[PDB]
Amino acid sequence: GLQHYKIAMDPALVRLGSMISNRYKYFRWTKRTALVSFMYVVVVPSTIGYLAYKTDGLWDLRAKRRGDLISER
Amino acid sequence: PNITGFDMREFLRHTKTPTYDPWERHEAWRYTGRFSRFNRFKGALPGFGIATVAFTAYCV
Amino acid sequence: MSLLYVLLIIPIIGIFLISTIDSFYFFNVSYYKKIALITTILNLIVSLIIYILFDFSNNQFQFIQENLDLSFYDIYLGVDGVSIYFVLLTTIIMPIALVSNWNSITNNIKSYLIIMLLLETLLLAVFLVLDVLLFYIFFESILPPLFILIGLFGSSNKVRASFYIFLYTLLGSLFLLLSILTMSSIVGTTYFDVLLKSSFEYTTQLFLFFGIFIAFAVKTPVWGLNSWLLRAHVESPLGGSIVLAAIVLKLSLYGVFRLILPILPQASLNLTYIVYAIGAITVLYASFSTLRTVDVKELIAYSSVAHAAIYLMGVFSNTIQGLEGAILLGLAHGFVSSGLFICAGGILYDRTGTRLIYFFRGLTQIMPLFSLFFFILCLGNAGTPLTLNFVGEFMSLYGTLERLPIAGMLASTSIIFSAAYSIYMYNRIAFGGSVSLYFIDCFRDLTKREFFILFTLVSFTVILGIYPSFVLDGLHYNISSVVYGIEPNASYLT
Amino acid sequence: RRATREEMRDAKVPLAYRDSCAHLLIPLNRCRYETYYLPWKCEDERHSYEKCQYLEFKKRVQKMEELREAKGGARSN
Amino acid sequence: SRVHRFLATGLGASMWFWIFYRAKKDGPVLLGWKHPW
Amino acid sequence: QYDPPTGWLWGVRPGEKYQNEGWEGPFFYGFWGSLIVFAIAYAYKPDTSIQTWALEEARRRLEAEGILEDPNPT
Amino acid sequence: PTPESEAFLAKKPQVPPTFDGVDYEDNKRLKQAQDAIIREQWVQVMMGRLVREELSKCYYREGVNHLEKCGKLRERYLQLLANAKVKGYLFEQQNYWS
Amino acid sequence: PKIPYPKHVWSPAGGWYAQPANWKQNTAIFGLVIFGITAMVWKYSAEHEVRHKMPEPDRFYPSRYWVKQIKDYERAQKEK
């Protein structure tokens, strides 16, 4: 809308920003990429979720004296 | 070995004050009365001299 | 007449006044902005009066109005401890959002002002209705005004941004709608008082959880479902970008207090490891990417995804500290996030026309006041103490940790990673050189308008961070009703 | 005479020094209070308390002259 | 400004004079000759 | 030597003065003014928190024990 | 003991903190039962805060001999710490025991 | 020397070499403000500083001259 200050618009920097903005159109399912997508979308959440499942209710600190245990399961 | 005639041992062998150099007349100022081996350590322990006399007086 | 209906009808009077002055008197577009600004402040006045009559230890909904005119769909309004602070935050933010875009909106000023006033009535109805079908009616009613606001006043990629927000919200909501419909069939209504004393079967609770959680996961947003936010928060005008990140995101956090915790107790307890897996994955992934984001707006927008995960984990803590800190976090976040969008989308963008962090450097040399507020704002985004962000961060992390230690531990890496991107963005813009050499034209510092809306926002986040008892006091008794559990010697007393 | 706990809890001496010799610890801690802990004021009775420290220490080092040989000069620690 | 020289020497003189004085009295004790008592 | 302080606050040059845009009266007299007036009024709002109610009962419950010597011996 | 003020008359629960013998069709009764459950839990927890305050006063009063002169509160706080907790009314409202 | 700088930049910390012509007059005003509320902090502290031990009468203890929780104790002990 309203005019802004004069900026020394770098052609290289404005084409890097356009490439980064438009990058989603050129993605393909290649050999390495499916491994990256599988690793970070499936494996890592699955590992984090599984350890949460196996440690749920396991420990409690609330008022544990000497003679009790942190573990409850 | 070392097609360029640089040998580390002779580099190390030439690690001293040279008998003649093209540069003493500009470099000699560093090794002078102000910066002699004696005048530089003349006050390495500033107050040591006076305290020794004072300590002896207290002992006696 | 109830003060709660006064909240809803005042912004509609402003819509009527703005659209009608031209007939009453070539009216100057400055008058509509004064009408729109005065309308939002009158609304804040009623909210401040409601909060001063509010009772912090009452379980019955307050400021209700008798209807005795039962139709199929009726609008019932009420306010308790959990919903009042979300109401106050909408009323505090809306005047600032209008003043933030005072000079930037140059065309269609009636359209811009009428949509914002409509959005205030619609957003406030969400926290005020007393029915789960009413809740959905207003949660999804904001889609048309938000679609038109982005396409009319957005940036270059506005069409894609306006298509992304409507379609994701429409899709996630239709899954929430199918769950809300199943409940109405079982209970016969979704009025809060009737529906709250319903105890669904566990298997029903599981399929009710999903769909409701599918919806709220898209509107949280959680990582992997967050493409709409980066497109729509960045392309949206500064005023609409403020409302989207300060109020719109907080409808799903408040929706857990009405649709998940009091009526799906067992499912929430059993499926907590899924939520904490998504939340911890979201914290990590949303943090590493915002380290690499080169759009300053996209970087502030996507840090919200990282904080939204933290109070989403705190709302599943089943801990009075985590639940309260989650509300404090969502309340504090709507202050800091509003200010950061002003700093980036309002102050940098209006002066340079570009959002690329490449072109900015060393603005402290020219803009002392901007660096002052932008530094306190980055300290709040990093959860530094003496800020309400710290208190919400700290309390919802304790609840997350006490519920699932390992998930709370992984979530507790945001102390490192949120500071990692808040100071990295600060030291590249305010510091890190003398002044950017792409600025062939020296800048002016903060104007009085830029100074006041920022000063107000850092004031709320700091006073409430030194005395969080202002919010915590009215929040204690009502969140006590959303915990699920008993003690071996403090239950079934005779 | 040995200082019983009743006047020795009231004296507020540290736990690790709650032993037989602490009867001389109570007066030592009063000079420190009265003389602002200056290390030139009650050196006299400080030496007395430090002296009784030595004797009890000596009785605790001679007690292994039969214990060490009982283990044949092994590692008692 | 000769005042700087006097403070330098004074601090050095005060320091060293202290070590001899603190060695005349405390010196025998830490050498294993005389226990304090 | 030191220089006198300088600069244009709000970007207003020494020759000119700041010009009101239209948001100042509503923001200062309305939003900020209401928030101040709300603050003093909050100082008189009666206490309605669950703690100060529960501290009163808990005070009596501990009073009927060895703790918290009560003012009256009943 | 300290007399109850008008503040501790309006909000004083008029009904025992139970969900037994309550008709959930009576909205007022269910809410009163819910309220009474919450007030009892909050009192036990605030009993911890008060006891925690004399234990704090004892600790700085005694100093060295706090480990043998402030143990009466140490159990009293520890018992309250292990028992008092605001857990809500929702589990008892949906399950009955014994 | 002295670094050149813009004269159009307004800083709250002053700027580049900012010393006002009235520095002393305003330093006096601010010093009174600092003293004024420091005394208020002193007044509040003296009333709410809580102790569990009473200093000996013969001992240096300037707190005795303002703090109330032991000021009343001295006069209370002065009754026998």
XYZ file of C-alpha atoms in Angstrom, chain F residues 19-71:
53
model
C 0.611 15.715 14.435
C -2.292 13.633 15.827
C -3.391 10.766 13.527
C -6.785 10.033 15.145
C -5.917 7.044 17.404
C -4.412 9.045 20.269
C -7.515 10.206 22.119
C -9.223 6.818 22.005
C -6.029 4.991 22.985
C -4.917 7.205 25.866
C -8.217 8.429 27.303
C -10.132 5.245 26.417
C -8.017 2.049 26.455
C -5.268 3.191 28.851
C -7.615 5.391 30.909
C -10.091 2.514 31.393
C -7.221 0.152 32.344
C -6.059 2.594 35.030
C -9.584 3.177 36.338
C -10.008 -0.597 36.338
C -6.827 -0.929 38.419
C -7.982 1.299 41.291
C -11.393 -0.366 41.211
C -9.681 -3.765 41.416
C -8.161 -2.653 44.730
C -11.687 -2.584 46.182
C -13.003 -5.745 44.530
C -13.809 -8.187 47.355
C -11.621 -11.287 47.681
C -13.274 -14.345 46.139
C -10.367 -16.791 45.771
C -10.555 -20.376 47.015
C -7.331 -20.011 49.027
C -8.375 -17.228 51.398
C -11.547 -19.226 52.004
C -9.573 -22.426 52.561
C -6.876 -20.725 54.651
C -9.626 -19.722 57.080
C -10.926 -23.271 57.510
C -7.449 -24.819 57.472
C -6.453 -22.330 60.166
C -9.232 -23.703 62.375
C -8.365 -27.312 61.516
C -4.746 -26.816 62.555
C -5.928 -24.789 65.555
C -7.674 -27.924 66.822
C -4.227 -29.572 67.011
C -0.836 -28.808 68.532
C -0.159 -26.211 65.824
C -1.222 -22.558 65.628
C -2.125 -21.614 69.193
C -5.602 -20.159 68.823
C -6.496 -16.797 70.417
